[PDB]
Design a protein around this ligand. Structure first.
Ligand SMILES: CC(C)C(=O)Nc1nnn(C)n1
Ligand SMILES: CC(C)C(=O)Nc1nnn(C)n1
Ligand SMILES: [Cl-]
Ligand SMILES: [Mg+2]
Ligand SMILES: [Mg+2]
Ligand SMILES: [Mg+2]
Ligand SMILES: [Mg+2]
Lengths: 194, 194
């Protein structure tokens, strides 16, 4: 029933643009919306990846590896899954593995890859693949992992036990001014609810 | 260590604005970022998302989701019921109200997240994630009455919580929808738990 009629550019930056979207509602009436899109998306199946990195070590509880960074749009520090945009021609899996190593130091093994999922679909067209990766924390490669952050990237690694993730996130939010990402929080909630 | 120095308006619509953010990087170098903000925030957060756990005796426990046309996405998406928090509304009340408008179910609050970020590399958008149980054996949830506002056109999709990730993947494979990332994240953790 519903579909896009036209997309009119309002303002275009280097990284983001705003568009006036005209679409057909399901009663046959023309309506409009204000849409956000990234300027960087080309032939990629999604803008980005986020990595769910399960760190596995013998005689350790499995940890979820998370990153803490300053996010200018938020005016603050945020706790997120490791994540980055997919480079042109790069596979979501390769981007996941690369972004994980860059942000955390860890070399993971691919477990699973989602289809393209939407980040905030009432606002933007941004999509990611959510890539589950296991990290062999016994392997010497992953012993004393060093983040190789890029030009103007600055990341702290926080590994939390999967079996206590939600309380461990709550405890971090209690100590300081910082925001948890909605995907991380949804994942931690479902761990509790299972 | 890092912080905002100034924000320059680039373009302001009715619903969304685009800003150029200047910030101090942790080396003491001044850097810029393109940031999206909603023009509606008053409030703990912009919006709520509801995790609606439909509990009926002798049936699998279901998670209740909604399917809508999303003009920024140019297509249909599957999402937790959700909407913006009205001025002077609590997140808890916004959650029950949105859940009722979008699904017709009347539910009870189990828990409520702190404000969590939606896409912090792009926007300052936040939500409260509100876990709600629905007593599907209660008379008021027999024939649920979805009362959508002006311009919302919502389909309800309840899926068993214990097979949620496979059910979603099926829908994406069969019906060319986009699953929301918070929805997919929750679904993953339900598989990853234990
Ligand atoms: C349905 C109302 C509450 C709304 O959020 N409308 C809208 N139109 N463009 N953007 C972005 N958002
Ligand atoms: C670090 C690079 C890849 C980046 O995403 N820069 C940027 N600047 N404004 N937005 C939005 N995003
Ligand atoms: Cl529950
Ligand atoms: Mg990143
Ligand atoms: Mg990166
Ligand atoms: Mg809604
Ligand atoms: Mg509504």
């Amino acid at each position: 029933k519903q579909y896009i009629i036209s997309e009119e550019l309002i303002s275009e930056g280097k990284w983001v643009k705003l568009e006036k979207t005209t679409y057909m509602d399901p009663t046959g009436k023309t309506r409009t919306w204000e849409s956000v899109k990234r300027t960087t998306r080309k032939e990629q199946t999604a803008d980005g990846v986020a990595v769910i990195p399960v760190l596995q070590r013998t005689l350790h509880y499995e940890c979820i590896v998370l990153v803490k960074q300053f996010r200018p749009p938020m005016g603050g520090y945020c706790i997120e899954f490791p994540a980055g945009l997919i480079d042109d021609g790069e596979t979501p899996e390769a981007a996941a593995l690369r972004e994980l190593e860059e942000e955390t130091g860890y070399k993971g093994d691919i477990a699973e890859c989602s289809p393209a999922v939407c980040m905030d679909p009432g606002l933007s067209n941004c999509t990611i693949h959510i890539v589950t990766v296991t990290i062999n924390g016994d392997d010497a490669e992953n012993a004393r992992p060093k983040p190789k952050p890029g030009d103007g990237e600055f990341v702290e690694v926080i590994s939390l036990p999967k079996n206590d993730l939600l309380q461990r996130l709550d405890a971090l939010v209690a100590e300081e001014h910082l925001t948890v990402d909605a995907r991380v929080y949804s994942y931690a909630l479902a761990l509790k609810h299972a």
